[PDB]
Write a protein that binds this ligand. Structure first.
Ligand code: CDL
Ligand code: CDL
Ligand code: CDL
Ligand code: PC1
Ligand code: 3PE
Ligand code: 3PE
Ligand code: 3PE
Ligand code: PLC
Ligand code: PLC
Ligand code: DGT
Ligand code: MG
Ligand code: ZN
Lengths: 459, 347, 98, 99, 320, 39
């Protein structure tokens, strides 16, 4: 994995040693070249994973999350060029440094073969993420957002640290490959109940689980555009990736310990979807959409079937491109009107004809229109949960209705109707804005043709 | 104070600590504690103001009372064993007084009320010695007598130090008091692992000394002693605020920084000994320390607090402060995690 | 141990409780501190002399020297307190609460 | 006023001083090279060549081989009197059940 | 060899380079009192270095290339605008006085550094000990709010307590009516608007507060306007002064070492002139200060430490 | 919309004797700037 780690580190010298007026050009160009080379990780075999060394490996679960990660960095640099326009050069090159350092921790996190190496980099992503939110947020609530985003994660991460070390002293190794052959069943005792929670609550908070989600509406809303894109596109999937790995060593206790977290997800799925029907902030509405969508991933991971895992992986990748796209679309409006209220600028389809097409395509994937990978992932989870309990179709069907209501309501409150009269600064769509959306949707739509590469290790 | 006398006094503080470390006789250990205290009071009085006088008086009474208890433990040990070797004490009552005398010297809770006040009333340079070098000698004795220490007593002192250290620092706007309560909080970690693996006590001590030295050096570089005064550093020396952010984040125990190494290693040792509740409580309780560090980051680096007009007159002069080893200490305080297996040199 | 140890060891306790309960005067507390060292001197002297520990006979003198040298420092701080507030009252040493 | 502070600046429209602005930068020369790298490395390399590369992956996850292997076994085990598939993945001769 | 603990040990004591003719002298008086000429005459007669009265750009004259910097890197405080609109709500009234005290404080550290390092005396004009006369005049005329006076005292009482006072104070007494007569003849368009009440208050501050307090620790010489024209007579009195009162008699090498370590570190001198006291006159918003700081760093020979600027012909940067 | 930065009201919350005022902590003046109390 050094072939991707070293180039990522060399972007930092590139930014600092580049011309004062070429920081964006050089970083964007060379970050796209790193993304292009990540396609070599798809050399996957049907029996064994691609094991590079004692430290790093990449299987069919890590590969799609790596390509989305390295592909997201170029798109975050395009989105940041506007609000970082009157910023002094040194701080602009520090902002890019934080983004690069975040990618470096992420790709190593998704390939760490050792679960304690996974933990360190897993926690290492908080530092740059916190710095981006609090130093380059526009509102006074960004300072409070960082505290919520920091202490919610650490409140659950520290118990995970103890549990991981306890496992090593018992099994003898936290290397993932070894655990696949040395895993022993978990007895039903009170000690193992809290070992289960410690190993899982660190990831429930990041997914996030309903009830433990109050940090997301504060962090995703106060963060700059680049922070929101990575926050909702990759950093939420850090929790999902964690469960898919650590649930290996929690059987058969996951059969009953998952009930409280399936009801929070199945019901919290409906609640957060309902919240989006009455949100007065466009960015906040998208934040609550991630909570509703990630509720499916928790259910799929906790029922442990070949179809649930296939759906969860496609859902995590599908939501990553969609959620990032929606934040970018919402920011283009903000860059003009400079206000997050959803009912302030209406009828935008009359002033920005092309940007309205992106809104439609973004909304359709959000509501899982087939054959998009948004539907493929959601459909597979629905098939698996039906076999888990036939009554769940009621809850996951009601969520479909609500998801279509708030997604098209978002598309109708901003793009249709009557244009606001007193807003006269809605300039045409820049090439930067249009190209930013095309990069989100084209790969999202292209994956439909060959979707087996995002179906995970159980394909 | 004449420079030559200042050097001689400083060397006497070190000689006092060194005698405690190299001595195999309790009387010589007690002598080192007396010499060390004798030569640290003068540097606390160097500024000759009422607050410095009060701080020295409180410091003298606490150490003096601790010293008497330490000599009482040695004599009781002598009665029941007839020897002075610096090893496990041979009477449980001697062990309690020795353990409690060392707690008072270290400032561990509930023998902590003096640390926030003594540190406040003395300059930053004096406070740096009090919080970093003064813990080498008491920790040396614990490293040698830990087999005979009562397990419940040492963990009770360690737990209360973490709680009171975390809670005390929340209500502080004076930096010297913030460091004073951060010293107490980190002390609990050192003495909490001591029964299980003394080596991790040394590892935590070294890391704490390096990080605490960096913060005091950076506070001294700008002569800042309050939260608001530190809030102008962005408008005077912008580079310094970035260093403070990295060090404060490290002191909070966040990965991938150096400060995570002692917390990470102490949990391992306690978990190997089937101690799961205490490390979890300690790790969670340390989030209080991470909080009031993060509150200094906001007021220093992550936000630009209001400035004053005369600050422009400071842009026309450079920093003449010595800032000795500051470039090296900051790196050791933030980028040493990939070298964690190097802790075996302490074994 | 012996009947003498009951009182010498109890003398240390009395002076210890006296040192931990200030009334008004800082001088009255340094005396209690000096009381502790006198009881330690007598208790250490008895143990060493009774057991015929020849080389330890110098230990009580070293204890007296360093303890007295500590009192000389304690008196210097009491004097400087008096020069500030005109009295050795400990209730005046409360500027460091805030 | 409680302090001496600058007035809030107003956002500058990049279409005023440059109607051909692509929105990437104020400099008309940089603004045109930022667009090219995004469009050449984004749409012409990662997508067009990446999409082709993913299209011709050499038998991803050994799936086409498995189909060709099963046809071989079906030919063998079907025209030899053997069952098409067994209910035991491992022969009982190697297992030793309890008691 | 930069002066420090090592140089003092090696032999750089203050008394080894100070004589009976190494004195610090301040010439004080009202506006247009002739102190400039009198001070510049005592300087040349006794062989003493002359420090022109610190102004708004004194600090700019001791750093960089010595030329005055643009006004925005001085707080935007202008002496000219003070006379035109003393009641301006922006805060130029006090923002000037707070800045001027810093410059006087900075100069008094420059003066003592010269005296303690070379042994040569200095002659000053309105040292920090006498800058409060303009404070009282501004306040008694309703030119500054009460809190501004409180802010001035807080800054003064933590800075003026570190330095020694002047050896000799020469006060050029002038009646107020004559002073205002000289203002008109001088020809300054803005200074002519100075009212008589403002000038009378300055005299009361001198006669009521400065002189009575200064006489207990300095050798005070009082001269009318006419007497001040006989520079030889004034210098004669200075050479006959007893020098028996004041803190300067208690100073030795050990104490003068500690003082020198302070006045040479100009940031340690200016440390308490920016106390975190939020007063609208002197408080500056983060956005404004951030913008000005970046501009200041772009001026010639100021981006890096003095001596490392390649854009002003400083060489060997790769070996310094 | 410019980025919000702390103002005097926000800053003064960190310039008191204590962060959390109570009945007892009232009347606590902040320490002197240079650590010297009047003689
Ligand atoms: C590679 C593609 C390169 C893009 C080149 C675009 C271009 O240059 O032409 C300009 C072209 C025409 O220019 P225009 O006249 O100015 O119209 C743009 C205006 O914004 C007005 O736009 P609009 O409102 O007329 O909407 C046009 C858009 C959407 O219009 C719609 O009808 C709404 C979508 C409803 C589709 C529901 C049908 C069910 C789909 C499942 C059946 C399969 O049409 C499509 O997306 C394709 C037709 C559906 C197939 O612009 C567009 O049409 C929109 C931008 C391009 C979006 C492309 C999205 C599809 C790309 C898929 C490629 C990968 C294959 C995926 C296979 C899996 C299928 C899920
Ligand atoms: C492993 C871990 C390694 C990390 C070690 C951390 C070292 C960081 C040092 C702090 C930065 C020094 C600084 O900026 O000056 C602050 C401060 C000056 O601040 P100031 O208030 O402006 O001036 C004070 C007076 O006005 C004085 O004004 P003055 O005009 O009368 O001048 C007196 C003369 C005095 O110059 C001297 O300082 C020489 C004195 C001899 C130092 C010991 C020599 C040891 C080698 C022979 C054995 O000149 C100076 O004061 C020079 C400024 C001090 C720079 C030299 C500092 C040496 C530190 C490295 C040696 C560490 C050994 C332990 C320190 C002693 C512990 C009590 O100087 C100190 O007193 C620092 C004492 C350091 C105590 C903490 C040391 C760390 C404890 C852990 C040791 C390693 C085990 C773990
Ligand atoms: C065993 C081998 C250890 C190597 C020791 C040689 C370095 C120390 C001598 C240089 C020195 O004065 O620093 C000592 C010490 C540190 O002064 P400093 O202000 O921190 O040095 C930085 C200045 O920029 C200093 O810049 P400067 O312009 O003021 O002076 C130039 C200086 C430049 O010398 C330097 O290179 C300064 C940096 C040297 C390294 C300082 C840290 C000591 C090494 C610690 C390494 C720890 C590694 C831990 C690894 C753990 C993971 C495996 O060159 C020399 O003085 C050569 C003297 C040769 C003796 O200065 C003293 O007060 C004692 C003299
Ligand atoms: C509608 C019009 C359709 C016309 C085309 C139909 C024919 C066709 O194309 O099929 C050929 C193939 C599928 O057909 P096929 O696989 O069945 O067979 C064709 C090739 N042979 C015969 C040799 C096997 O299409 C593709 O494979 C396209 C793959 C899309 C890849 C998209 C990823 C590119 C971007 C990567 C970086 C960014 C990603 C970010 C997300 C990260 C998630 C991993
Ligand atoms: C896995 C399951 C995950 C479960 C997650 C549960 C939730 C975790 C806690 C979330 C904390 C939310 C952020 C902290 C609250 C906050 O933002 O501060 C509010 C308040 C304001 O105070 P302050 O900011 O200092 O002053 C105003 C300055 N303008 O702040 C205060 O006044 C006091 C702040 C207290 C410090 C925060 C403590 C963080 C939580 C750890 C506390 C220790 C835990 C208990 C320790 C052992 C028992 C004591
Ligand atoms: C909100 C309030 C939250 C309250 C949480 C309270 C948690 C503290 C109590 C849990 C204690 C669990 C424990 O200590 O287990 C001990 C067990 C001992 O192991 P062993 O010796 O092998 O036992 C064999 C005996 N025949 O050890 C084990 O076997 C497994 C130990 C796994 C590590 C447990 C980590 C603590 C559990 C935290 C739960 C999650 C809480 C998340 C929120 C933060 C709090
Ligand atoms: C806002 C907070 C959000 C965060 C909340 C975090 C989650 C809350 C903590 C959950 C703790 C795990 C629940 C179990 C606690 C320990 C007891 C236990 O594990 O018993 C296991 C028990 C085994 O016995 P048995 O049921 O017969 O086995 C066959 C079952 N298939 O098997 C069982 O009894 C089945 C499981 C019993 C649990 C019943 C839970 C019912 C409530 C579900 C909604 C959760 C409401 C959360 C309230 C938050 C306020
Ligand atoms: C023709 C042709 O090679 O074009 C491809 C283009 C050149 O742009 P163009 O198509 O000539 O102009 C179109 C743009 N306009 C309308 C503004 C003129 O390559 C590039 O930008 C490549 C990126 C530069 C680095 C490549 C290194 C590999
Ligand atoms: C080996 C493990 C690592 C040790 C760490 C390195 C040493 C500490 C750093 C240097 C300290 C230092 O020099 O002290 C501070 C000052 C430094 O002189 P300055 O004027 O500030 O600068 C001058 C140089 N410049 C400006 C060019 C940079 O020196 C002294 O006061 C010197 C005192 C010497 C006499 C001591 C008295 C007699 C002692 C014996 C009594 C029994
Ligand atoms: N606000 C304020 N103005 C001052 C201060 N010192 C001088 N000024 C102003 C008053 C005058 O307008 C100008 C110079 O006044 P002077 O005292 O130096 O008298 P003048 O220059 O006219 O002639 P002279 O030197 O006395 O012979 O600077 C001060 O401390 N505060
Ligand atoms: Mg003049
Ligand atoms: Zn904008």
């Amino acid at each position: 994995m050094l072939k991707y780690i070293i180039p990522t580190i060399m972007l930092m010298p590139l930014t600092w040693l580049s011309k004062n007026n070429m920081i964006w050009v050089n970083s964007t160009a060379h970050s796209l070249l790193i993304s292009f080379t990540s396609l070599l990780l798809m050399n996957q075999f049907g029996d064994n994973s691609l094991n590079f060394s004692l430290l790093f490996f990449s299987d069919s679960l890590s590969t799609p999350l790596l390509i989305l990660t390295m592909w997201l960095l170029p798109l975050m640099l395009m989105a940041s060029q506007h609000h970082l326009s009157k910023e002094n050069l040194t701080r602009k090159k520090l902002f890019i440094t934080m983004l690069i350092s975040l990618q470096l921790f992420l790709i190593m996190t998704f390939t760490a073969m050792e679960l304690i190496l996974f933990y360190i980099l897993f926690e290492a992503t908080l530092v740059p993420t916190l710095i981006i939110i609090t130093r380059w947020g526009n509102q006074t609530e960004r300072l409070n957002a960082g505290l919520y985003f920091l202490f919610y994660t650490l409140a659950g991460s520290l118990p995970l640290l103890v549990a991981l070390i306890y496992i090593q002293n018992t099994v003898g190794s936290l290397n993932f490959l070894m655990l696949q052959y040395w895993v022993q069943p978990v007895h039903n005792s009170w000690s193992n109940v809290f070992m289960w929670l410690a190993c899982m609550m660190a990831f429930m908070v990041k997914m996030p689980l309903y009830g433990l989600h109050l940090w997301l509406p504060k962090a995703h809303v106060e963060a700059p555009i680049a922070g929101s894109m990575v926050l909702a596109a990759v950093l939420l999937k850090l929790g999902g990736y964690g469960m898919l790995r650590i649930t290996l060593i929690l059987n058969p206790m996951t059969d009953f310990m998952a009930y409280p977290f399936i009801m929070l997800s199945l019901w919290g799925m409906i609640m957060t979807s309902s919240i989006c029907l009455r949100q007065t902030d466009l960015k906040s509405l998208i934040a609550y959409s991630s909570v509703s969508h990630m509720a499916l991933v928790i259910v799929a991971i906790l029922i442990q079937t070949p179809w649930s895992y296939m759906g969860a992986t496609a859902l995590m990748i599908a939501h990553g491109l969609t959620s990032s796209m929606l934040f970018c679309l919402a920011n283009s409006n903000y860059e003009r009107i400079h206000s997050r209220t959803m009912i302030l600028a209406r009828g935008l389809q009359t002033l920005l004809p092309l940007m309205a097409t992106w809104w439609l395509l973004a909304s359709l994937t959000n509501l899982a229109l087939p054959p998009t990978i948004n539907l493929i992932g959601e459909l597979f989870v629905v098939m698996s949960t039906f076999s888990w309990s036939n009554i769940t179709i009621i809850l996951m069907g009601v969520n479909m209705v609500i998801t279509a209501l708030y997604s098209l309501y978002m598309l109708i409150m901003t793009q249709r109707g009557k244009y606001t009269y007193h807003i006269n600064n809605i300039s045409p769509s820049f090439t930067r804005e249009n190209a930013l959306m095309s990069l989100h949707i084209l790969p999202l739509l292209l994956l439909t043709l060959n979707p087996k590469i995002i179906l995970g290790p159980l394909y | 104070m004449n420079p030559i006398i200042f050097i001689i006094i400083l060397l006497t503080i070190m000689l006092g600590t060194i005698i405690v470390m190299i001595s195999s006789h309790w009387l010589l250990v007690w002598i080192g504690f007396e010499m060390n205290m004798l030569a640290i009071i003068p540097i606390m009085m160097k500024n000759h103001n009422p607050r410095a006088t009060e701080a020295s008086t409180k410091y003298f009474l606490t150490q003096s009372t601790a010293s008497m208890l330490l000599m009482m433990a040695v004599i009781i040990n002598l009665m029941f064993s007839g020897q002075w070797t610096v090893m496990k004490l041979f009477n449980p009552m001697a062990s309690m007084l020795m353990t409690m005398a060392l707690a008072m010297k270290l400032g561990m809770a509930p023998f902590h009320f003096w640390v926030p006040e003594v540190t406040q009333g003395i300059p930053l340079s004096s406070g740096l010695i009090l919080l970093t070098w003064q813990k080498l000698a008491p920790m040396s004795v614990l490293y040698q007598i830990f087999p005979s220490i009562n397990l419940n007593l040492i963990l009770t002192l360690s737990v209360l130090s973490i709680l009171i250290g975390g809670w005390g620092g929340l209500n502080q706007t004076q930096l010297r008091k913030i460091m004073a309560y951060s010293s107490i909080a980190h002390m609990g970690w050192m003495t909490a692992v001591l029964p299980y693996n003394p080596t991790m006590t040394l590892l935590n001590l070294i890391i704490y000394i390096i990080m605490t030295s960096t913060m005091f050096t950076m506070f001294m570089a700008n002569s800042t002693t309050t939260t608001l005064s530190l809030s102008h550093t962005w408008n005077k020396t912008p580079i310094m605020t970035v260093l403070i952010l990295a060090t404060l984040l490290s002191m909070g125990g966040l990965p991938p920084l150096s400060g995570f190494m002692p917390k990470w290693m102490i949990i391992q040792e306690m978990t190997k000994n089937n101690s799961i509740i205490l490390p979890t409580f300690m790790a969670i309780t340390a989030l209080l320390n991470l909080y009031f560090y993060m509150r200094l980051t906001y007021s220093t680096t992550l936000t630009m607090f209001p400035s004053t007009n005369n600050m422009k007159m400071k842009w026309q002069f450079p920093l003449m402060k010595k800032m000795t080893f500051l470039p090296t200490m900051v790196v050791l305080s933030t980028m040493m995690l990939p070298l964690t297996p190097m802790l075996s040199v302490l074994e | 141990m012996s009947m003498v140890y009951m009182n010498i060891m109890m003398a240390f306790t009395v002076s210890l409780v006296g040192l931990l309960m200030y009334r008004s005067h800082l001088m009255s507390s340094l005396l209690c501190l000096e009381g502790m060292m006198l009881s330690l001197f007598v208790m250490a002297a008895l143990t060493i002399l009774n057991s015929h520990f020849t080389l330890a006979s110098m230990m009580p003198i070293i204890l007296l020297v360093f303890a007295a040298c500590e009192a000389a420092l304690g008196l210097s701080l009491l004097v400087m307190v008096s020069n500030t507030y005109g009295t050795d009252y400990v209730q005046n040493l409360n500027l460091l609460q805030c | 006023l409680r302090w001496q502070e600058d007035p809030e600046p107003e956002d500058e429209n990049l279409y005023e001083k440059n109607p051909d602005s692509h929105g990437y930068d104020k400099d008309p020369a940089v603004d045109i090279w930022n667009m090219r790298v995004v469009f050449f490395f984004g749409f012409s390399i990662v997508l067009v060549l990446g999409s082709t590369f993913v299209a011709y992956l050499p038998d991803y996850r050994m799936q086409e081989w498995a189909r060709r292997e099963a046809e071989r076994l079906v030919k063998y085990r079907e025209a030899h009197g053997l069952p098409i598939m067994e209910s035991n993945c491992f022969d009982p001769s190697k297992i030793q059940l309890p008691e | 060899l930069q002066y420090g603990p090592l140089a003092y040990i090696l032999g750089e004591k203050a008394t080894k380079k100070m004589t009976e003719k190494s004195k610090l002298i301040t010439v004080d008086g009202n506006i247009c009192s002739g102190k400039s000429k009198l001070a510049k005459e005592i300087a040349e007669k006794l062989g003493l270095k002359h420090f022109p009265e610190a102004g708004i750009h004194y600090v700019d004259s001791t750093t960089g290339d010595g030329k005055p910097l643009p006004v925005q890197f001085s707080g935007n405080c202008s002496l000219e605008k003070f006379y035109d609109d003393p009641k301006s709500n922006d805060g130029n009234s006090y923002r000037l006085q707070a800045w001027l005290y810093a410059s006087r404080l900075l100069q008094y550290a420059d003066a003592l550094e010269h005296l303690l390092s070379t042994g040569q005396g200095v002659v000053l004009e309105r040292s920090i000990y006498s800058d409060f006369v303009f404070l009282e005049a501004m306040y008694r005329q309703g030119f500054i709010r009460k809190q501004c006076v409180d802010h001035y005292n807080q800054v003064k009482k933590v800075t003026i307590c570190e330095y020694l006072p002047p050896h000799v104070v020469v006060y050029v007494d002038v009646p107020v009516p004559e002073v205002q007569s000289r203002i008109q003849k001088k020809g300054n368009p803005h200074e002519m608007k100075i009212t008589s009440a403002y000038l009378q208050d300055i005299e009361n501050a001198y006669k009521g507060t400065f002189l009575p307090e200064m006489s207990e620790k300095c050798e005070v010489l009082q001269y009318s306007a006419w007497e001040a024209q006989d520079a030889e007579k004034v210098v004669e009195d200075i050479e006959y002064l007893k020098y028996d009162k004041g803190p300067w008699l208690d100073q030795n090498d050990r104490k003068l070492h500690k003082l020198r370590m302070l006045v040479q570190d100009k940031l340690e001198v200016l440390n308490y002139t920016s106390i975190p006291v939020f007063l609208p006159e002197v408080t500056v918003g983060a956005h404004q200060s951030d913008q000005v700081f970046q501009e200041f760093t772009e001026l010639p020979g100021r981006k890096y430490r003095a001596g490392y600027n390649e854009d002003v012909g400083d060489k060997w940067i790769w070996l310094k | 919309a410019r980025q919000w930065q702390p103002d005097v009201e926000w800053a003064e919350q960190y310039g008191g004797a204590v962060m959390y005022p109570t009945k007892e902590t009232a009347h606590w003046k902040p320490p002197p700037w240079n650590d010297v109390d009047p003689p």
